[PDB]
Write a structure and sequence with these properties.
Chain A: Belongs to the DXR family. Chain A: One of its GO terms (molecular function) is 1-deoxy-D-xylulose-5-phosphate reductoisomerase activity. Chain A: It holds the Pfam family DXP_redisom_C. Two copies of one chain form a homodimer. Chain A is an alpha/beta fold. Chain A has three domains: about 140 residues, 3-Layer(aba) Sandwich (Rossmann fold); about 140 residues, no CATH class; about 90 residues, RNA polymerase sigma factor, region 2, helix turn helix motif (Rna Polymerase Sigma Factor, Chain: A), CATH 1.10.1740. In chain A, about 45% of the residues lie in helices and about 15% in strands. Chain A has 14 helices and twelve strands. Chain A has a seven-stranded parallel β-sheet, sandwiched between helices. In chain A, strands 9-8-10-11 form a four-stranded mixed β-sheet, with helices on one face. Chain A is globular. At the A-B interface, helix 6, strand 11, helix 10 and strand 12 of A face helix 6, strand 11, helix 11 and strand 12 of B. Bound molecules: NADPH dihydro-nicotinamide-adenine-dinucleotide phosphate (NDP) (3 copies) and magnesium ion (MG) (2 copies).
């Protein structure tokens, strides 16, 4: 059996990974990390007989027949001790950057669900990947699809987007939208943040930057289309007229299983061909202004990190009632203005300093907009 | 760096589309051609491509003089032995493609296979020669090219798509009485009279299923055919996890030709741009395409597959000549196959060629019966 560690086991991706382990044999889960959801963590440790846990938040796990690592280097120290064959990196937020770097150091394969790691610190991940040679497979549905059809000479890589919860609403009504209108979603079963991110298309902006890092694509070779039905997860347009497309049901257990079991294909449920509707349209810049900030930020890890930080602050603020929907892209825009002229970060510490300064600035902007 | 090419059957549809590709991308030098009887087109290919080597497979005069000319029944094998091309495009029509593919596998580094008969009738022979030589074989057919591009060992289903042919929207009662003028109109693809009729009966698709089993080493049970009226999807693989990989492209044979010739490089032609579509996939009606549903009966026997091919060749020509109506085609095939029930599995090229010859003779007798009746 191949040994597995799931970082962020208590989250959406984490628990879907557990579901997959019940459905397919050949991997043994030997450790998990979680942040603060102790009740769920307890269920997992009992159900899966997990003897190694890294606590990442300010919570009390005790104990006493299981090894419990706690604090800021818990993930790193657990991974060094366990040296798993496979690590699923399903932590949310900016913590994903250090989690991925530690996973690359101590695992033979890293299954990457966390987006922030490549958005903010892709240059660090790429350096570590080259040095260590660790296998890295994306878990995101769109990058899993691309991974399956990618080749060296492409004309265009097409990512598809649902258009989010407000895809149908007209422009003037979107500014005023409340949380009770953004949840949800209406295509994927995901955490509260990702749902807001799909509605602003910030999620898709992250995926473009992730695709550039993962597949060494220039910005100009990527295109994003709104695709209502959510069947096509990615397509590659080749120079000869051929297009390779990947279709599947919208269930994250599919790309999870692929990343865990590659090069084997897991037996889940085959998707049988039938008459089908495939629509592809350009995102309207007036409906998705934060998405169109990509051109402005793509070349700078300082601006990419600030983009992510401001989005984290604005979504939280939106979820807590301080701003309305139209305030999200404004917080991001106004925060980015304050980082123009920043030098390109060179180290993990540089990236971390930008992130915390940007959180600080975005909070000030949010206060103004509240 | 430059690769040399021989095109067997250079004067045909595939051959001239290959020439069209060679005019608009560099890296391949045409050094030899074969043709059967189209002297006028062969000389013009020779002049315009500066070809110095020609194999004539038919009984025609091609004299002389500044070029090397091979003639008679061994002309392809002899020219290939002399030329040793890097690539041979095998685009001869009909049963002689089996001999041509085997000859090509002897003397090329890569064989681009357009000819269907070679695998339908003699797949076991081709596979044996492939193993001994270790030469590359890339299919040129657009469905096989599509599958080649997405194939992997653990597929659940390989899906070939079919236009359904000229009579796809017709009532079953009208089909039996159809004439060549009904069939020889063009729903999705631009090709010869033979391929157009085979598309209407879906015998073309029966050939492609058998070729797919040979090319990709798939059991018959893992192949699915769907009628796909848009003709945009040329093939798909269904994986056991829920993923489906599909290949979409314009219905232009220059695409898979360029892919086979230049693999692993992709030639810059005209990129296809994604847009809103419905995509239809329906099962073929057994009552509409009876000759297609003879697959399950013939699939394990090279004797039956060779007879199926021969009977088809006879029946299609008789149809085009006005001797039988469209419904007569599947009847010629069925009745000819009934005469070969129990024939032993051929073991050599010579066994295959004997079955071919007798099935042609048997199918002609059947055709006369149906014509006079
Ligand atoms: N959900 C989806 O469908 C998809 C998600 N992704 C990406 O995967 C990542 C995780 O997504 P999702 O599972 O939905 O997120 P969730 O919020 O549902 O769960 C995230 C996990 O990370 C833990 N966590 C939270 N904060 C920290 C922290 N500061 N340090 C370490 N661990 C922490 C949580 O612990 P606890 O519960 O105890 O607080 C939980 O275990 C994200 O980057 C997301 O963009 C990508 C594609 C699709
Ligand atoms: O309720 P059940 O009795 O149906 O079993 C639960 C499933 O989860 C699997 N499972 C439990 N713990 C682990 C683990 N640590 N790693 C991988 N799979 C696990 C079990 O496999 P198993 O019985 O092989 O541990 C079993 O397939
Ligand atoms: N056409 C298409 O779109 C596709 C075709 N194919 C397959 O490719 C093969 C050829 O296709 P296509 O180019 O359309 O056929 P054509 O009838 O257009 O031409 C066949 C070629 O074979 C030569 N030829 C004819 N008879 C003989 C013979 N007895 N011995 C040696 N050579 C002969 C012809 O010479 P000449 O002109 O001098 O008589 C010509 O060069 C067939 O198996 C067909 O099914 C597969 C996929 C797509
Ligand atoms: Mg995604
Ligand atoms: Mg074909």
């Amino acid at each position: 059996e191949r040994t597995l560690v799931i970082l962020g086991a208590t989250g959406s991706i984490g628990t879907q990974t557990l579901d997959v382990l019940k459905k397919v044999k050949g991997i043994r889960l030997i450790g998990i990390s979680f942040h603060s959801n102790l009740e769920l963590a307890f269920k997992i440790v009992k159900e899966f007989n997990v003897k190694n846990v890294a606590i990442t938040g300010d919570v009390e796990f005790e104990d006493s027949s299981i090894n419990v690592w706690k604090g800021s280097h818990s993930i790193e120290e657990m991974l060094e001790a366990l040296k798993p064959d496979i690590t699923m990196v399903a932590v949310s937020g900016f913590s994903g950057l250090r989690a991925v770097l530690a996973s690359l150091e101590h695992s033979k394969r890293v299954c990457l669900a966390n987006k922030e790691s490549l958005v903010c610190g892709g240059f660090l991940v790429k350096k570590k990947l080259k040095e260590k040679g660790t296998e890295l497979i994306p878990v995101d549905s769109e990058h899993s699809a691309i991974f399956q059809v990618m080749e060296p000479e492409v004309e265009k890589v097409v990512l598809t987007a649902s258009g989010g919860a407000l895809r149908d609403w007209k422009i003037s009504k979107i500014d005023r939208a409340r949380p009770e209108d953004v949840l949800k979603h209406p295509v994927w079963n995901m955490g509260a943040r990702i749902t807001v991110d799909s509605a602003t298309m910030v999620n898709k902006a992250f995926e473009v930057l992730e695709a550039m890092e993962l597949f060494e694509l220039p910005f100009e070779k990527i295109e994003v289309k709104i695709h209502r039905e959510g069947l096509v997860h990615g397509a590659v347009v080749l120079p000869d007229g051929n297009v390779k497309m990947v279709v599947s049901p919208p269930d994250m257990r599919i790309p999870i299983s692929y990343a865990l079991f590659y090069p084997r294909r897991v037996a889940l449920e085959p998707f049988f061909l039938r008459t089908i509707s495939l629509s592809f349209e350009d995102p309207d810049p007036e409906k998705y202004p934060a998405f169109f900030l990509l051109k402005e930020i793509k070349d700078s890890y300082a601006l990419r990190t600030a983009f992510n930080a401001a989005d984290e602050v604005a979504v939280e603020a939106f979820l807590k009632g301080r701003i309305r929907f139209g305030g999200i892209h404004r917080v991001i825009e106004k925060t980015l203005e304050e980082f123009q002229g920043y030098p390109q970060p060179r180290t993990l510490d540089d990236v971390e300093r930008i992130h915390f300064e940007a959180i600080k600035k975005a909070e000030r902007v949010t206060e103004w907009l509240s």
